[PDB]
CSV table of C-alpha atoms in Angstrom, one decimal:
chain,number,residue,atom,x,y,z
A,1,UNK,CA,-6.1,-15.7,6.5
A,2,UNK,CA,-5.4,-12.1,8.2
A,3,UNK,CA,-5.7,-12.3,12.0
A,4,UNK,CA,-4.7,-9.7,15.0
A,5,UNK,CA,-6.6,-6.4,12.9
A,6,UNK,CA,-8.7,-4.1,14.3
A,7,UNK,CA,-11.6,-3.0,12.1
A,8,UNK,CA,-12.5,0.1,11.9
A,9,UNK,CA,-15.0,0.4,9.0
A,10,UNK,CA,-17.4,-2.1,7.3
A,11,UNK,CA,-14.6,-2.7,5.0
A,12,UNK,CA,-11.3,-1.6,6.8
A,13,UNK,CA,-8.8,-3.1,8.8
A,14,UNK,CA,-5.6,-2.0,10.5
A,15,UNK,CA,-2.7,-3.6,12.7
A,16,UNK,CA,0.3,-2.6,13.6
A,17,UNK,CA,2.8,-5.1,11.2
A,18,UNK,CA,5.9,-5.1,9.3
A,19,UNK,CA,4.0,-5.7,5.7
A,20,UNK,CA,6.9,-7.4,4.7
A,21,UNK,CA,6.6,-9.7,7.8
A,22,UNK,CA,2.8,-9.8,6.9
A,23,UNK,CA,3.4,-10.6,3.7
A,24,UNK,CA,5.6,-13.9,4.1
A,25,UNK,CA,3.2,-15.1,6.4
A,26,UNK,CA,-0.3,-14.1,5.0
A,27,UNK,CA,0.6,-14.4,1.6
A,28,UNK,CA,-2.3,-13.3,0.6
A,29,UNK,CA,-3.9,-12.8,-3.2
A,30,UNK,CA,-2.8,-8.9,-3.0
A,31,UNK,CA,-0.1,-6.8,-2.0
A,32,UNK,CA,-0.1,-3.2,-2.1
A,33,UNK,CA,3.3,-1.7,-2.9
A,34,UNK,CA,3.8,1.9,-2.2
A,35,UNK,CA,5.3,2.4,-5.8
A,36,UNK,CA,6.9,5.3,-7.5
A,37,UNK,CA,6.3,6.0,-11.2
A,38,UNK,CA,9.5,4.6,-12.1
A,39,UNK,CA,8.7,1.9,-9.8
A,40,UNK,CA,12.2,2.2,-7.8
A,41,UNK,CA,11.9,0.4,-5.2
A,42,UNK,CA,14.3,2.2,-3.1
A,43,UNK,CA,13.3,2.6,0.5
A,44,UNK,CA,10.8,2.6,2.2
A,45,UNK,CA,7.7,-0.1,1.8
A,46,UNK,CA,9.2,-0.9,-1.8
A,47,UNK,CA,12.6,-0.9,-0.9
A,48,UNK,CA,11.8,-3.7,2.1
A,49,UNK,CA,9.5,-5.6,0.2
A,50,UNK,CA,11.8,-5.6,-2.8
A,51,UNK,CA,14.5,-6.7,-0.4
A,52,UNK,CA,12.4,-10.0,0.6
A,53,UNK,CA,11.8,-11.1,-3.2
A,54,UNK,CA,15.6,-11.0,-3.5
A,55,UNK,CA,15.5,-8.1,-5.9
A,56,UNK,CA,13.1,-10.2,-8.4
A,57,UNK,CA,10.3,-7.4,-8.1
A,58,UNK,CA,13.1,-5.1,-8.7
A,59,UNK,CA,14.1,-7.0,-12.0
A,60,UNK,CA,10.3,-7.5,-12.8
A,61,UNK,CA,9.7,-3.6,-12.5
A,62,UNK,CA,12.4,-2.5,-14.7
A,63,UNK,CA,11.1,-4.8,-17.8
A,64,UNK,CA,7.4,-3.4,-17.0
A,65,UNK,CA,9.1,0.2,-17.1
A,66,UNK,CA,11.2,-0.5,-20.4
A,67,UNK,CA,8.0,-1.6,-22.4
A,68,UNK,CA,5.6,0.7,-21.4
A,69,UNK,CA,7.0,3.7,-19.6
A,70,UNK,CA,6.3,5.3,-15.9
A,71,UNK,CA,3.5,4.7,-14.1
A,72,UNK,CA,1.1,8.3,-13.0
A,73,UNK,CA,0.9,9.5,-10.2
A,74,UNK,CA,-2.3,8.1,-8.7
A,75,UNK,CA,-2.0,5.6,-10.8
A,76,UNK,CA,-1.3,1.3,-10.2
A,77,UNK,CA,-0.1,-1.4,-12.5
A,78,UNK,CA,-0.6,-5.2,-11.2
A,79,UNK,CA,2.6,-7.4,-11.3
A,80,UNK,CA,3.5,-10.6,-9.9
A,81,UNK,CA,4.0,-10.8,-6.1
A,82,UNK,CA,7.0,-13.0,-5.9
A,83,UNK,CA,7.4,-14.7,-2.2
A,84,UNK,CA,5.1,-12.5,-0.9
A,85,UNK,CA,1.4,-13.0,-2.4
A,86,UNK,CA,-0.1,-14.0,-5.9
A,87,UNK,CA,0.1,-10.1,-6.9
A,88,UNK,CA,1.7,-6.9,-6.1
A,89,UNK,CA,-0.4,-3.7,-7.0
A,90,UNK,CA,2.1,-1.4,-7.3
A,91,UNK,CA,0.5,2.2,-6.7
A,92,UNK,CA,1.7,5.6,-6.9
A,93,UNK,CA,0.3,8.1,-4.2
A,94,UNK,CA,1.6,11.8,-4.1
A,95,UNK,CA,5.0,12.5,-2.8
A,96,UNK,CA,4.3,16.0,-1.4
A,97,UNK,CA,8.4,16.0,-0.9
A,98,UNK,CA,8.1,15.8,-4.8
A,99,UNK,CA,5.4,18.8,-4.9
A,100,UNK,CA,3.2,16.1,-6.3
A,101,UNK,CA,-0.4,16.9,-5.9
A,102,UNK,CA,-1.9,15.4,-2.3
A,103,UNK,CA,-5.6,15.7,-4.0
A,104,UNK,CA,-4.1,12.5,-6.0
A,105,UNK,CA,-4.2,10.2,-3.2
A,106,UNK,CA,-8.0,9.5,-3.4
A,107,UNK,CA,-7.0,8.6,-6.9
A,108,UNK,CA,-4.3,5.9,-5.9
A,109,UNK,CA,-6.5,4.7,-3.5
A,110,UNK,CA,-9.3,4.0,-6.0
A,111,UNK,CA,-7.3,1.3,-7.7
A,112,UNK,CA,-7.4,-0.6,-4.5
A,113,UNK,CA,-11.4,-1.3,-5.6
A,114,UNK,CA,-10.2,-3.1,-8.5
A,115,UNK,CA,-9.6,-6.0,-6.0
A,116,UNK,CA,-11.7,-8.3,-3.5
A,117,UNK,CA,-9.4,-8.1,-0.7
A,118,UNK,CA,-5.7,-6.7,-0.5
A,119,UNK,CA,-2.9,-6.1,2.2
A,120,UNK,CA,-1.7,-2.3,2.0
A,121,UNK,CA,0.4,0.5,3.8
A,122,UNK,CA,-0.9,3.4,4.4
A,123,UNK,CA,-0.6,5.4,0.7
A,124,UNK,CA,1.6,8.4,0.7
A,125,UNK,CA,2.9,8.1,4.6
A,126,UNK,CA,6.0,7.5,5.6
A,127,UNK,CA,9.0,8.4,3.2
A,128,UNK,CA,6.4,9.9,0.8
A,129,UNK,CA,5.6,12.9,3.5
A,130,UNK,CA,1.8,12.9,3.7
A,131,UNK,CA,-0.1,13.0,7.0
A,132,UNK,CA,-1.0,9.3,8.2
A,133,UNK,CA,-4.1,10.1,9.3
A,134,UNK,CA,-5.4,11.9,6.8
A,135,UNK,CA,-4.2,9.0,4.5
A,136,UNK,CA,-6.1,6.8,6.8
A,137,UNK,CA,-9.6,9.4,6.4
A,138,UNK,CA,-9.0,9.3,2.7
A,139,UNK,CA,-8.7,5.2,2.7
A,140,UNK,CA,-11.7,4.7,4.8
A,141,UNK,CA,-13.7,7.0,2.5
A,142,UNK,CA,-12.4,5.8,-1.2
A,143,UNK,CA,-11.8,2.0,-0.8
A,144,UNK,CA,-14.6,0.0,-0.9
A,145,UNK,CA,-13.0,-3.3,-1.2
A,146,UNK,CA,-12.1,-5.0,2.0
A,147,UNK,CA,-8.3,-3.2,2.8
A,148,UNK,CA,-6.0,-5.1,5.9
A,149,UNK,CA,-3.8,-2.2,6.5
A,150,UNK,CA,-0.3,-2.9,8.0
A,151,UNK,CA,1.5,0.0,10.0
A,152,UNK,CA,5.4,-0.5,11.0
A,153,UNK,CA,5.7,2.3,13.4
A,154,UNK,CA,3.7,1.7,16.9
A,155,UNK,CA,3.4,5.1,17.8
A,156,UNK,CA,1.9,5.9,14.8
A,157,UNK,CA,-0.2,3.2,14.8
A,158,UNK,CA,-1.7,3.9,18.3
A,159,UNK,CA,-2.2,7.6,17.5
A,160,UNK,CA,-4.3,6.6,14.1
A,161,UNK,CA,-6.4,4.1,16.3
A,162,UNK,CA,-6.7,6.5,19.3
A,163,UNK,CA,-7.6,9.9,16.6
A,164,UNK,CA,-10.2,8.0,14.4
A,165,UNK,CA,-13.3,9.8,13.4
């Protein structure tokens, strides 16, 4: 199971980890990608997870898209995890570089209750320009469900640890 996190809530865990890296090693029942709509799995967490399953989640996406259209924002849709866990949850926080609406992260982090236990990124950080730590406030205060958060950058990850509450 999950080891090296530091807890921070009742339900909340964080460590500073490649997810993908996580991933293959864990393999846990859940992974969290941080999806767009048209589940593109570009760059950032999608783009390096979708990189590890050989493109399958990639190839996987695109038949979910072509039979029932994009995803919302705030929104989720479970598919299979490939390599790196029994299931991917692929959810869509706000991409304020989009103009997308930030209010909308609660939202994509209320899909996360849907599951016992899940391996995530931080929703709408990195290449999806939200503040970290206020991603972090809104996890801790949404998710109920117990959440092992995996965060690349070690600076970041030391100023969310070092800021919280």
């Amino acid at each position: 199971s999950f080891s090296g996190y530091l807890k921070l809530t009742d339900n909340v865990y964080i460590k500073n980890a490649d997810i993908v890296e996580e991933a293959k090693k864990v393999k846990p029942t859940v992974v969290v990608n941080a999806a767009n709509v048209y589940l593109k799995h570009g760059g950032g967490v999608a783009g390096a997870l979708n990189k590890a399953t050989n493109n399958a989640m990639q190839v996987e996406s695109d038949d979910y898209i072509a039979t029932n259209g994009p995803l919302k924002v705030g929104g989720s849709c479970v598919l299979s995890g490939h390599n790196l866990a029994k299931h991917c949850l692929h959810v869509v926080g706000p991409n304020v570089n989009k103009g997308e609406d930030i209010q909308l992260l609660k939202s994509a982090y209320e899909n996360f209750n849907q599951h016992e236990v899940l391996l995530a990124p931080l929703l709408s950080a990195g290449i999806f320009g939200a503040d970290p730590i206020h991603s972090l406030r809104v996890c801790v205060d949404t998710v109920r469900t117990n959440v092992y958060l995996a965060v690349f950058d070690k600076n970041l990850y030391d100023k969310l640890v070092s800021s919280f509450l």
